[PDB]
Amino acid sequence: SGFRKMAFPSGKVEGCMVQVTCGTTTLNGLWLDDVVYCPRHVICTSEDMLNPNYEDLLIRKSNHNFLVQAGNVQLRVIGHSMQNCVLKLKVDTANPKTPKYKFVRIQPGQTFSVLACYNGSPSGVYQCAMRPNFTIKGSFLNGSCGSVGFNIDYDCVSFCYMHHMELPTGVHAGTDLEGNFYGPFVDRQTAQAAGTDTTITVNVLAWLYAAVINGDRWFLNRFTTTLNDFNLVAMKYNYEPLTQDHVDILGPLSAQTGIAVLDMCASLKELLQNGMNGRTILGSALLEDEFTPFDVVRQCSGVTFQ
Amino acid sequence: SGFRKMAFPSGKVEGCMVQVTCGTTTLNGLWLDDVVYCPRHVICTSEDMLNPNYEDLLIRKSNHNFLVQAGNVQLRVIGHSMQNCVLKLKVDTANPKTPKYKFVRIQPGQTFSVLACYNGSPSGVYQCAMRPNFTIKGSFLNGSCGSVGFNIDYDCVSFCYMHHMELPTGVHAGTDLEGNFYGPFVDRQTAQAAGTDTTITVNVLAWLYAAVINGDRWFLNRFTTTLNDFNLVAMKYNYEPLTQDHVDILGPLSAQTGIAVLDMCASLKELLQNGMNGRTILGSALLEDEFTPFDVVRQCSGVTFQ
Numbered sequence A, B: 001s002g003f004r005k006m007a008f009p010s011g012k013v014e015g016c017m018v019q020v021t022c023g024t025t026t027l028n029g030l031w032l033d034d035v036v037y038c039p040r041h042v043i044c045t046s047e048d049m050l051n052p053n054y055e056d057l058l059i060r061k062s063n064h065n066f067l068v069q070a071g072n073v074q075l076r077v078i079g080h081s082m083q084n085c086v087l088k089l090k091v092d093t094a095n096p097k098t099p100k101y102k103f104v105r106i107q108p109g110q111t112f113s114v115l116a117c118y119n120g121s122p123s124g125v126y127q128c129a130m131r132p133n134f135t136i137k138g139s140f141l142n143g144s145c146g147s148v149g150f151n152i153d154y155d156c157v158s159f160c161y162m163h164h165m166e167l168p169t170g171v172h173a174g175t176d177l178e179g180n181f182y183g184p185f186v187d188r189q190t191a192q193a194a195g196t197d198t199t200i201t202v203n204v205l206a207w208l209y210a211a212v213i214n215g216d217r218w219f220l221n222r223f224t225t226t227l228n229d230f231n232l233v234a235m236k237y238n239y240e241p242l243t244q245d246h247v248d249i250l251g252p253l254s255a256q257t258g259i260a261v262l263d264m265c266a267s268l269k270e271l272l273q274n275g276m277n278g279r280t281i282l283g284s285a286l287l288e289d290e291f292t293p294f295d296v297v298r299q300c301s302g303v304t305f306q
């Protein structure tokens, strides 16, 4: 029993991180087979950042302007190209630690682990969610660009995020591994604003089911509601609307605890309208929305990886 | 910027986990050089658990009653012995992935990362603190015994915890890697109770400094207090007393923010006496005590590992 913010084991990703330097700028890269992936803004200088023209900046570089290091070894760059907002550096050596992997573009509400890195070296791992406004609430300092987010499915690493920048509100923005930003952001040092964020309802319900599984039941009641009555109250508190697909996703947790989804929705309705009265759920005094239904199942039923 | 519950990268530990079976009982082991370390209760059957006599139970076993698997490979056990509450299984092959390591017995209030494992396979990583009552608030299911806790210092893995059991309150108890329990527990399936827990004051203050570093300042005030006046109020709320060594430990965070420790103590005094008024700090509505001063520095100044 117990319930923690649990990240995936990071070892398969640690062996893919490298350091990329172009000029006086150093950040992290991801080395898979014989390609190093990194944010294209590594090629900017201070003069370029407010409004870079990346096609111009790249035509002015050659292979030897890029220094790639994996620990002590230097990797010889033998070609370069740009895909959307990522740079792809072809190197002369295939990474012998390349895991089975794929690239996935995730949707808002999904969770992933971040391996935060500096100078090509892993510093720490943590779990976060992609917010509805396509930012993440990360923890990143100077030098962290190029750190990646991932999930593990069986034996396969699904890369879903590469870190590019911090916004003025202190939250973070980046791309999938094909270089497409999540959200309406661009890789220039202009001032950009994230849209208003909402609470991820299906995740809050998954976490209430985790609470029940761990013996925290004080918030339950005998009422029920309809999807339409619930969504009317949720909109007033800036919660995402609940769909029938969400209800079906929660099926396994409803079955395991014997509490119907629409009954759990009635409890959540009461908690939105009356607050928690200085009581806690799973050790929190706020409603938590960065666990998916799959996170809860995984952690309350015990799945491992190869 | 940002602040997360950040674990150490787990890759150096992942390569040390193995599966140990004795009879019908399987749990996890830690394979370092040519020794596998695991909880000694792997040798108990249902008849033994209420009151095992481990010296008797072990004399009745031979090397071949122990099945050790590292993935697909089976390791041949060529000797066995007991140290306190851990079993040490000598095997015929030295683990080629053995990191630089040491064994440390930690003190209450310190933090570490846990690599939760099932059947020798890593399932997830999370950060926890050793509580003042020598339990940890973990997340562990059936099959998790033998999972380890660790820190990383430069290039060295410091192992500090091996998981042995869950107590009736849902919290967890285990040993250092020389087999000595933390706290007054024993490895028999009797009912054992943990002592009353307290809040780790020096960690709460470290987390308030992290808040200031990230722009959350609403709780600050101009007052100050003395160590003796603070400790009088803290005892009333079940907070650990603050010592001069704690004050000195917080030195680097005091310097970086310009707020004296005893000024921060005056703010904490007000928060204990008046509550948080439905305001939050770093995204929490409770005072958080599982970050040490070193955790905060590491995360708000950017240290990596080799």
Ligand SMILES: O=C(c1cc(=O)[nH]c(=O)[nH]1)N1CCN(c2ccc(Cl)c(Cl)c2)CC1
Binding pocket: A041, A044, A049, A052, A140, A141, A142, A143, A144, A145, A164, A165, A166, A172, A186, A187, A188, A189, B001
């Ligand atoms: O290393 C960090 C960083 C990341 C973070 O998350 N937090 C933090 O404090 N620093 N930066 C800030 C972003 N920068 C940058 C350069 C050129 C362009 Cl064109 C763009 Cl868009 C961004 C690179 C260096």
Ligand SMILES: O=C(c1cc(=O)[nH]c(=O)[nH]1)N1CCN(c2ccc(Cl)c(Cl)c2)CC1
Binding pocket: A001, B041, B044, B049, B052, B140, B141, B142, B143, B144, B145, B164, B165, B166, B172, B186, B187, B188, B189
């Ligand atoms: O695998 C878990 C487990 C661990 C956990 O943390 N949570 C959970 O639900 N299950 N167990 C429970 C403890 N058990 C045990 C056997 C013999 C002795 Cl003599 C003792 Cl002391 C303990 C081994 C199997």
